Amino acid sequence: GLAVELKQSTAQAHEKAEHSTFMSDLLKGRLGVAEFTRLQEQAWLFYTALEQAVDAVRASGFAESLLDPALNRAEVLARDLDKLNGSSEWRSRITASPAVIDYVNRLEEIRDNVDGPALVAHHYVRYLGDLSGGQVIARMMQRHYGVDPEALGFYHFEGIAKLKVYKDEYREKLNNLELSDEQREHLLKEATDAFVFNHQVFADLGK
Ligand SMILES: C=CC1=C(C)/C(=C/c2[nH]c(/C=C3N=C(/C=C4\NC(=O)C(C)=C4C=C)C(C)=C\3CCC(=O)O)c(CCC(=O)O)c2C)NC1=O
Numbered sequence: 422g423l424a425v426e427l428k429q430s431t432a433q434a435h436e437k438a439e440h441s442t443f444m445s446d447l448l449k450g451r452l453g454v455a456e457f458t459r460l461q462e463q464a465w466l467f468y469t470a471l472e473q474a475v476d477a478v479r480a481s482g483f484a485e486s487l488l489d490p491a492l493n494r495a496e497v498l499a500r501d502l503d504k505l506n507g508s509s510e511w512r513s514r515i516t517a518s519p520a521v522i523d524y525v526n527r528l529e530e531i532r533d534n535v536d537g538p539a540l541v542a543h544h545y546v547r548y549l550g551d552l553s554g555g556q557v558i559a560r561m562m563q564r565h566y567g568v569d570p571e572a573l574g575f576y577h578f579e580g581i582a583k584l585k586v587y588k589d590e591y592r593e594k595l596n597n598l599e600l601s602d603e604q605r606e607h608l609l610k611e612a613t614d615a616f617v618f619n620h621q622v623f624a625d626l627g628k
């Protein structure tokens with residue numbers, strides 16, 4: 422089924438991204454809230470784009486049930502960024518790193534083409550990862566750096582009760598999407614690209 426094909430097809434790419442030096446250093450406690458704050462700022466930029474593409478694709482009637490508005494992160498992230506930075510100065514200060522320009526560009530292309538299969542791929546890579554590994558990242562931020570849980574809204578998924586059931590239903594929804602061979606292939610290739618973008622985001626943060 423598609424959920425299994427996605428996981429396996431992308432496993433290599435998930436591994437490259439997951440074990441990048443910046444994320445590895447961040448999670449081990451080698452870095453700081455400032456570095457975590459920089460990541461969330463870059464994530465705000467790309468979640469903002471992702472969610473415009475989700476909106477376009479949901480509106481077209483494609484994969485509707487999967488593209489649960491409860492997953493939207495951009496607004497909670499801004500709120501986390503207001504707390505982390507102590508004001509909204511960040512909105513005028515932040516600039517997309519080169520990795521984020523490419524990532525955001527691809528998201529805007531998908532938005533504008535209203536490319537359902539491609540958007541699903543990006544949705545899987547960001548949201549199922551947030552739901553899967555996000556409590557680990559949040560827990561490390563509180564543990565290593567004393568980050569206040571109120572500045573970790575991005576990881577809380579307010580509005581979802583049983584998380585493992587949610588993930589299971591999300592995978593069933595993936596397995597239920599109607600897709601041509603052409604569309605399945607395009608989705609799978611796009612999932613690898615999504616991991617490729619995210620790894621470069623961390624590389625650029627590492628620099
Ligand atoms: C850009 C980096 C990055 C992305 C986009 C990412 C996404 C991601 N991680 C996942 C699972 C997972 N992710 C992790 C671990 C991590 N996940 C993390 O993001 C980090 C920092 C860790 C480090 C511990 C583990 C253990 C699983 C298995 C859980 C599952 O399959 O639901 C899944 C679901 C796999 C599936 O069920 O098909 C996705 C889409 N993981 C990443 O690392």
Ligand SMILES: [Fe+3]
Nearest residue numbers: 439550553554
């Ligand atoms: Fe992960």
